[PDB]
Design an enzyme around this catalytic site. Structure first.
Site, PDB file in Angstrom:
ATOM      1  N   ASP A  15      45.863  49.700  33.538  1.00 33.16           N
ATOM      2  CA  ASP A  15      46.107  48.289  33.281  1.00 33.16           C
ATOM      3  C   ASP A  15      44.923  47.320  33.284  1.00 33.16           C
ATOM      4  O   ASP A  15      45.131  46.099  33.128  1.00 33.16           O
ATOM      5  CB  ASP A  15      47.187  47.781  34.241  1.00 33.16           C
ATOM      6  CG  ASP A  15      46.808  47.936  35.696  1.00 33.16           C
ATOM      7  OD1 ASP A  15      45.605  48.039  36.009  1.00 33.16           O
ATOM      8  OD2 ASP A  15      47.728  47.948  36.540  1.00 33.16           O
ATOM      9  N   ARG A  29      43.396  42.209  32.720  1.00 33.17           N
ATOM     10  CA  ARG A  29      44.416  42.870  33.493  1.00 33.17           C
ATOM     11  C   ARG A  29      45.678  42.573  32.720  1.00 33.17           C
ATOM     12  O   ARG A  29      45.924  41.423  32.360  1.00 33.17           O
ATOM     13  CB  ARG A  29      44.487  42.236  34.884  1.00 33.17           C
ATOM     14  CG  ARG A  29      45.647  42.689  35.754  1.00 33.17           C
ATOM     15  CD  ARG A  29      45.649  44.191  35.916  1.00 33.17           C
ATOM     16  NE  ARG A  29      46.574  44.609  36.957  1.00 33.17           N
ATOM     17  CZ  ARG A  29      47.883  44.774  36.794  1.00 33.17           C
ATOM     18  NH1 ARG A  29      48.456  44.556  35.616  1.00 33.17           N
ATOM     19  NH2 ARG A  29      48.620  45.178  37.819  1.00 33.17           N
ATOM     20  N   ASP A  34      52.344  47.069  36.118  1.00 33.10           N
ATOM     21  CA  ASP A  34      51.488  47.686  37.091  1.00 33.10           C
ATOM     22  C   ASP A  34      51.471  49.182  36.891  1.00 33.10           C
ATOM     23  O   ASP A  34      52.516  49.835  36.949  1.00 33.10           O
ATOM     24  CB  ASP A  34      51.934  47.374  38.515  1.00 33.10           C
ATOM     25  CG  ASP A  34      50.954  47.907  39.555  1.00 33.10           C
ATOM     26  OD1 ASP A  34      49.719  47.875  39.312  1.00 33.10           O
ATOM     27  OD2 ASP A  34      51.417  48.374  40.613  1.00 33.10           O
ATOM     28  N   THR A  35      50.301  49.704  36.534  1.00 34.15           N
ATOM     29  CA  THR A  35      50.143  51.141  36.394  1.00 34.15           C
ATOM     30  C   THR A  35      49.639  51.606  37.754  1.00 34.15           C
ATOM     31  O   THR A  35      49.043  50.808  38.512  1.00 34.15           O
ATOM     32  CB  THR A  35      49.116  51.533  35.324  1.00 34.15           C
ATOM     33  OG1 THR A  35      47.896  50.808  35.523  1.00 34.15           O
ATOM     34  CG2 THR A  35      49.665  51.276  33.954  1.00 34.15           C
ATOM     35  N   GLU A  37      47.562  53.203  40.859  1.00 31.39           N
ATOM     36  CA  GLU A  37      46.180  53.118  41.311  1.00 31.39           C
ATOM     37  C   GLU A  37      45.440  54.430  41.245  1.00 31.39           C
ATOM     38  O   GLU A  37      46.000  55.487  41.519  1.00 31.39           O
ATOM     39  CB  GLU A  37      46.149  52.632  42.757  1.00 31.39           C
ATOM     40  CG  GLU A  37      44.758  52.418  43.316  1.00 31.39           C
ATOM     41  CD  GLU A  37      44.065  51.260  42.657  1.00 31.39           C
ATOM     42  OE1 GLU A  37      44.639  50.146  42.654  1.00 31.39           O
ATOM     43  OE2 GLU A  37      42.955  51.463  42.127  1.00 31.39           O
ATOM     44  N   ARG A  81      39.791  37.963  36.545  1.00 26.56           N
ATOM     45  CA  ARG A  81      40.233  38.807  35.430  1.00 26.56           C
ATOM     46  C   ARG A  81      41.123  38.016  34.463  1.00 26.56           C
ATOM     47  O   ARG A  81      41.927  37.187  34.897  1.00 26.56           O
ATOM     48  CB  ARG A  81      41.020  40.017  35.943  1.00 26.56           C
ATOM     49  CG  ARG A  81      40.198  41.030  36.699  1.00 26.56           C
ATOM     50  CD  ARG A  81      41.033  42.247  37.121  1.00 26.56           C
ATOM     51  NE  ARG A  81      42.186  41.871  37.948  1.00 26.56           N
ATOM     52  CZ  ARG A  81      42.981  42.724  38.595  1.00 26.56           C
ATOM     53  NH1 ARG A  81      42.757  44.029  38.533  1.00 26.56           N
ATOM     54  NH2 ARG A  81      44.047  42.272  39.250  1.00 26.56           N
TER      55      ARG A  81
HETATM   56  C1  LIG Z   1      49.122  41.294  36.793  1.00 25.48           C
HETATM   57  C2  LIG Z   1      48.645  40.253  37.859  1.00 25.48           C
HETATM   58  C3  LIG Z   1      47.955  40.635  38.933  1.00 25.48           C
HETATM   59  N1  LIG Z   1      47.607  39.732  39.922  1.00 25.48           N
HETATM   60  C4  LIG Z   1      47.042  40.167  41.238  1.00 25.48           C
HETATM   61  C5  LIG Z   1      48.123  40.561  42.215  1.00 25.48           C
HETATM   62  C6  LIG Z   1      47.420  41.562  43.051  1.00 25.48           C
HETATM   63  O1  LIG Z   1      46.611  40.911  44.033  1.00 25.48           O
HETATM   64  P1  LIG Z   1      46.140  41.655  45.390  1.00 25.48           P
HETATM   65  O2  LIG Z   1      44.906  42.337  45.000  1.00 25.48           O
HETATM   66  O3  LIG Z   1      46.029  40.475  46.255  1.00 25.48           O
HETATM   67  O4  LIG Z   1      47.247  42.574  45.733  1.00 25.48           O
HETATM   68  C7  LIG Z   1      46.486  42.284  42.129  1.00 25.48           C
HETATM   69  C8  LIG Z   1      47.234  43.431  41.443  1.00 25.48           C
HETATM   70  O5  LIG Z   1      46.371  43.983  40.471  1.00 25.48           O
HETATM   71  P2  LIG Z   1      45.955  45.487  40.539  1.00 25.48           P
HETATM   72  O6  LIG Z   1      47.207  46.195  40.121  1.00 25.48           O
HETATM   73  O7  LIG Z   1      44.845  45.704  39.527  1.00 25.48           O
HETATM   74  O8  LIG Z   1      45.646  45.692  41.960  1.00 25.48           O
HETATM   75  O9  LIG Z   1      46.102  41.272  41.176  1.00 25.48           O
HETATM   76  C9  LIG Z   1      47.807  38.375  39.771  1.00 25.48           C
HETATM   77  O10 LIG Z   1      47.389  37.528  40.547  1.00 25.48           O
HETATM   78  N2  LIG Z   1      48.466  37.996  38.662  1.00 25.48           N
HETATM   79  C10 LIG Z   1      48.941  38.842  37.689  1.00 25.48           C
HETATM   80  O11 LIG Z   1      49.568  38.340  36.773  1.00 25.48           O
HETATM   81 CA   LIG Z   2      47.508  48.771  38.839  1.00 26.67          CA
END
Ligand SMILES: Cc1cn([C@H]2C[C@H](OP(=O)(O)O)[C@@H](COP(=O)(O)O)O2)c(=O)[nH]c1=O
Ligand SMILES: [Ca+2]
Length: 135
Positions: A15, A29, A34-35, A37, A81
Site C-alpha cells: 500500500d 499511501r 490496509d495491506t 505489514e 505521505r
Molecule cells: C491510509 C491512512 C493511513 N493513516 C495512518 C494511520 C496509521 O497511523 P499509525 O502509524 O499511527 O498507526 C498509519 C497506517 O499506515 P500503515 O498501514 O502504512 O502503517 O498511517 C492515516 O493517517 N490516514 C490514512 O488515510
Molecule cells: Ca499496511
C-alpha cells in the site's frame, strides 16, 4: 475528484510507493485500505504481506499510465505521505487489492471516503469467495 499523472519511482509494499508528482518525488499511501505489514517489527512480516507487495509491484511496474486521485479532505497523513486513490492504466490499485483478498478496508476517515462503498462491496465479494486474507 480529478485524476492527475504521476510517474512510478519505486514500489515499497502493498500500500505504499514512491512517485514523482508535480516534479517532486513523494511517497504515497493508498486511501481506505490496509495491506499486511512486511516492515515495522511491531507488526512483523504479516501473512499475505509479501503477496500484497508483489501484486501491487507487478501492477504498477507494468502500467503504461499511473494516475493519482486525491479525495476531498487532507491530502497527506502525519508522516508526510500523500493519500490517494491510485490508478494503473485506468484500474484502481486500491480496489484491485481488496477484491483479491490482499487488503482490508480500513482507516476510513471522513471526508476522505468517497470510494468507501465501492471498496466495501468488493471486500464482501472477496470475503464470500474466502480469498486470501479471508480464507
Ligand atoms: C491510509 C491512512 C493511513 N493513516 C495512518 C494511520 C496509521 O497511523 P499509525 O502509524 O499511527 O498507526 C498509519 C497506517 O499506515 P500503515 O498501514 O502504512 O502503517 O498511517 C492515516 O493517517 N490516514 C490514512 O488515510
Ligand atoms: Ca499496511
Amino acid at each position: 475528484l480529478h485524476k492527475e499523472p504521476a510517474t512510478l519511482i519505486k514500489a515499497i509494499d502493498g500500500d505504499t510507493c514512491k512517485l514523482m508528482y508535480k516534479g517532486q518525488p513523494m511517497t504515497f499511501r493508498l486511501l481506505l485500505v490496509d495491506t499486511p505489514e512486511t516492515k515495522h517489527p511491531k507488526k512483523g512480516v504479516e501473512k499475505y504481506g509479501p503477496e500484497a507487495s508483489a501484486f501491487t509491484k507487478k501492477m504498477v511496474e507494468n502500467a503504461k499510465k499511473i494516475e493519482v486521485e486525491f479525495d476531498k479532505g487532507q491530502r497527506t497523513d502525519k508522516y508526510g505521505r500523500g493519500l490517494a486513490y491510485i490508478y494503473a492504466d485506468g484500474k484502481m490499485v486500491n480496489e484491485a487489492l481488496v477484491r483479491q483478498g490482499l487488503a482490508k478496508v480500513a482507516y476510513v476517515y471522513k471526508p476522505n471516503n468517497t470510494h468507501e462503498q465501492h471498496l466495501r462491496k468488493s471486500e464482501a465479494q472477496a470475503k464470500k469467495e474466502k480469498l486470501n486474507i479471508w480464507s
